A paper describes a structure:
The operons encoding genes of structural components of the secretion machinery and associated virulence factors are all under the control of the AraC-type transcriptional activator protein, ExsA. ExsA belongs to a unique subfamily of AraC-proteins that is regulated through protein-protein contacts rather than small molecule ligands. The ExsA protein consists of a ~100 amino acid carboxy-terminal domain (ExsA-CTD) and a ~170 amino acid amino-terminal domain (ExsA-NTD). The ExsA-NTD mediates homo-dimerization but is also target for ExsD binding.
LC-MS analysis revealed that this proteolytic product encompasses the entire ExsA-NTD (amino acids 2–178). In chain A both termini encompassing residues 2 to 10 and 166–178, respectively produced no interpretable electron density. Overall, the fold of this domain is characterized by the formation of a beta barrel structure, which, in case of AraC and ToxT, houses the ligand binding pocket. The beta structure is flanked by two parallel carboxy-terminal helices α-2 and α-3. Our structural data suggest that L140, K141, E143, and L148, previously identified as critical for ExsA function, are all directly involved in ExsA dimerization.
Residue numbers in the entry:
A (entry chain A), B (entry chain A): 11 to 165
The structure:
């Protein structure tokens, strides 16, 4: 379900993500480009990406990255569980970018090191579901939360 | 709800916990004694304690510890959310100790550093609820999980 990704890409490739998701760069480099914009991120930064098509590249480096896909089912079972707190979030903007970048935060950093750790140590599967709810809940708490919220109504 | 605790106790005191809970020693020393047994724990070790009465001491040290109370309501709303996975856990033993100690594990360690971090950095309140579900889920996954499960039916 949630995948460590050893990628080497010197030029670029194309991705076509039928689901919303999260790209997080564990080791190496990773660029994500949509029609609008380009995002270059350090480890262990992440991006939230809408449904869509994307240009990805590693710059020919050896890169371990983490792809977390967010099913519609999960996203519902999430907003269901927490919809009351999420109604504290403001409404819109209405463009919603499609690639959403997040300011580096110690709590976000901790949530990332949680995912890393989950690859290396044996655990219950549901600990990952929880780690993602935590990440999502941090997004919704962020300044960029209303973006996510706007994406979250459409589906 | 969830409380940092600056305690200095040179001899001992008495606690009478109407709820199940978790004691985790952030800085200092902490002993927890029930009728059966005594537990001395390093930072950042923790204990799960049943409903009951306890002898606690700091050994006169300056001690920051964390008391996480687990309401019956929460414990239900927890077992509800995850009762299917918890039915993988074995049944009993039937004594259930009353103080449950857990082997030091990197994932448990990470869950503890998550709680620490939650004191210092601003966050949504529900991130703590999640951190506790994570800790609980690690207990149920542990060798000592059936103990917890046995406690969890009684209530």
């Amino acid at each position: 379900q949630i995948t460590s990704c050893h990628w080497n890409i010197p030029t670029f490739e194309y991705r076509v993500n039928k689901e919303e998701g999260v790209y997080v760069l564990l080791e190496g480099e990773l660029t994500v480009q949509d029609i609008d914009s380009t995002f270059c991120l350090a480890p262990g930064e992440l991006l939230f990406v809408r449904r869509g098509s994307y240009v990805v590249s590693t710059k020919g480096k050896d890169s371990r990255i983490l792809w977390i896909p967010l099913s519609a089912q999960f996203l519902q079972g999430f907003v269901q569980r927490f919809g009351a707190l999420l109604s504290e979030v403001e409404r819109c903007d209405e463009p919603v970018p499609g690639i959403i970048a997040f300011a580096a935060t110690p709590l976000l950093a901790g949530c990332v090191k949680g995912l890393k750790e989950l690859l290396v140590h044996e655990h219950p599967p549901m600990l990952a579901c929880l780690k993602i709810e935590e990440l999502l809940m941090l997004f919704a708490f962020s300044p960029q939360g209303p973006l996510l919220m706007s994406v979250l109504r459409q589906l």
